[PDB]
Amino acid sequence: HMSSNTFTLGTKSVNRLGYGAMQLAGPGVFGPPRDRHVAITVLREALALGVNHIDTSDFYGPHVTNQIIREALYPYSDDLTIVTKIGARRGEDASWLPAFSPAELQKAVHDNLRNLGLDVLDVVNLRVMMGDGHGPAEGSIEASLTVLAEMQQQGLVKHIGLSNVTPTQVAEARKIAEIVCVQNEYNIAHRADDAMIDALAHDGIAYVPFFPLGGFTPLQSSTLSDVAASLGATPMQVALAWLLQRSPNILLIPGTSSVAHLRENMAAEKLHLSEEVLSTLDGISR
Numbered sequence: 001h002m003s004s005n006t007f008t009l010g011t012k013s014v015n016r017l018g019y020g021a022m023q024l025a026g027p028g029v030f031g032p033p034r035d036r037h038v039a040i041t042v043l044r045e046a047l048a049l050g051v052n053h054i055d056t057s058d059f060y061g062p063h064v065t066n067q068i069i070r071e072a073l074y075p076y077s078d079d080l081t082i083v084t085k086i087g088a089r090r091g092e093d094a095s096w097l098p099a100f101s102p103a104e105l106q107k108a109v110h111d112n113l114r115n116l117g118l119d120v121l122d123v124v125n126l127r128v129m130m131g132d133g134h135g136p137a138e139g140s141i142e143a144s145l146t147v148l149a150e151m152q153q154q155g156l157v158k159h160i161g162l163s164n165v166t167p168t169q170v171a172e173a174r175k176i177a178e179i180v181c182v183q184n185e186y187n188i189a190h191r192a193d194d195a196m197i198d199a200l201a202h203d204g205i206a207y208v209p210f211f212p213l214g215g216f217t218p219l220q221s222s223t224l225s226d227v228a229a230s231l232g233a234t235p236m237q238v239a240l241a242w243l244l245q246r247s248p249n250i251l252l253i254p255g256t257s258s259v260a261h262l263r264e265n266m267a268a269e270k271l272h273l274s275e276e277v278l279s280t281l282d283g284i285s286r
């Protein structure tokens with residue numbers, strides 16, 4: 001707890017252990033979850049445990065994830081931040097398609113508002129999808145961001161963020177609109193964004209890693225598992241605790257369909273990583 005367990009996202013304080021809602025839909029993040037009852041329970045328990053940052057999207061399931069959040073939690077407390085993301089849509093074959101035309105982005109914001117039961121969205125991330133590969137890639141985002149900026153000026157969107165972006169795209173974006181967070185691939189074994197994380201921190205912009213555990217080689221995984229065992233913890237817990245201490249602007253949004261996993265994830269706050277452990281951990285990427 002050298003770093004605070006809270007950070008200011010836009011204009012609201014959030015607990016840096018938050019909840020990502022992507023698991024509350026069927027396989028491929030498509031259709032209903034296996035059990036809507038359990039989904040509702042997880043969301044309510046998350047709030048009970050102090051979660052006040054939920055990450056979602058209307059193209060999760062399409063629509064159904066937001067509607068579950070609404071059934072479970074509406075009316076929302078003033079302390080809750082719901083972050084959503086636009087820029088993609090789902091094919092009938094559960095595919096993930098670009099959706100960056102002004103009509104599509106407007107529809108997306110419109111859908112989020114209806115399905116969450118809101119009049120204004122706290123934070124909308126623009127999910128950028130340049131190139132044929134999956135990660136960040138260069139290319140102007142001015143056109144989409146201009147559209148989002150209009151909806152902000154119209155009062156539909158309070159704050160704008162970015163997802164899946166290069167450091168250059170962030171710089172470009174910040175000329176058009178204020179950016180309150182960047183949501184990118186990042187974990188203990190994938191640390192390309194390290195310099196940007198620090199730069200963003202200095203400017204007071206949040207960084208939201210996704211995939212806390214994953215794309216790990218057997219040796220990477222074995223090392224994390226060794227550390228976890230030495231601490232009486234779970235690998236997920238170590239990965240989360242490591243992200244917490246990495247930088248004070250980092251917000252965590254682990255997703256789960258399981259109440260037990262949720263409790264375990266929130267318990268990662270209790271984990272103190274010694275400088276010895278950190279040396280082992282800071283060396284996993286290399």
Ligand SMILES: NC(=O)c1ccc[n+]([C@@H]2O[C@H](COP(=O)([O-])OP(=O)(O)OC[C@H]3O[C@@H](n4cnc5c(N)ncnc54)[C@H](OP(=O)(O)O)[C@@H]3O)[C@@H](O)[C@H]2O)c1
Nearest residue numbers: 020021022055163210211212236253254255256257258261
């Ligand atoms: N911006 C983007 O393009 C984008 C992309 C990916 C994700 N996201 C967001 O980021 C959030 C995080 O997603 P992620 O890709 O980073 O991965 P993640 O949600 O952290 O991992 C999901 C997997 O981890 C399992 N899990 C969670 N806690 C566990 C635990 N304590 N023990 C064992 N397994 C556990 C879940 O299974 P169980 O359900 O069985 O627990 C699920 O299979 C998502 O919820 C979503 O909101 C955004």
Ligand SMILES: Cc1ncc(CO)c(CO)c1O
Nearest residue numbers: 029057085087088096127129
């Ligand atoms: C496969 C896949 N593709 C695209 C996205 C977002 O554009 C996500 C998550 O928001 C994803 O999981």
Ligand SMILES: [Mg+2]
Nearest residue numbers: 020022023255
């Ligand atoms: Mg998830």
